Design a protein around this nucleic acid. Structure first.
Length: 117
RNA sequence: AAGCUUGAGUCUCGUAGAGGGGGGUAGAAUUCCAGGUGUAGCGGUGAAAUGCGUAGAGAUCUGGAGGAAUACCGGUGGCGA
């Protein structure tokens, strides 16, 4: 139950939800928060108004692990992809590294051609 | 019929091309397969709701299977009947 004080964090932001995880370098998820957790419907869940109020709800999910130094990984296009990071910095945590890992389309299967209006 | 070539043709040394055929040859995610870490959320629309989820989802990792097409350069561009 001593604090670990060092680790990693993973950010996901899609066009329909922001999902943030505080992780371990072994690939474990230690605590999580979702922007649909604020009760908001549809693409609201991808805005800073939703993503900025998931960060300290994610810091609450590791309250017995104890955090201080974090290395961040970020994926997805959603607007909330950085306000959730600044809100976590403003919670009293210190970012050791920031890296973007958003995929570049490879094969991609089938796209909308043929796109909804 | 006899006579020609400066109509037509083939070629010495050489030129580009997503053309065809046969071979290959390489990578990614939705998926599937066996599990961990973990808690109530996920999914989605102009609005919502069936539905996925506590049988432990979504997501995040380990090791692995499956199928298709060939990102970038790529255009002011080539080739092919």
């Amino acid at each position: 139950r001593k604090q670990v004080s060092d680790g990693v964090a993973h950010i996901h932001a899609s066009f329909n939800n922001t999902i943030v995880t505080i992780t371990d370098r072994q690939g474990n998820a230690l605590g999580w928060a979702t922007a649909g957790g604020s009760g908001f419907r549809g693409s609201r869940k991808s805005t800073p108004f939703a993503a900025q109020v998931a960060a300290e709800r994610c810091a609450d999910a590791v309250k017995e692990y104890g955090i201080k130094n974090l290395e961040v990984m970020v994926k997805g296009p959603g607007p909330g992809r950085e306000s959730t990071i600044r809100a976590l910095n403003a919670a009293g945590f210190r970012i050791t590294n920031i890296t973007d890992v958003t995929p570049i389309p490879h094969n991609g299967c089938r796209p909308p051609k043929k796109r909804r209006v």
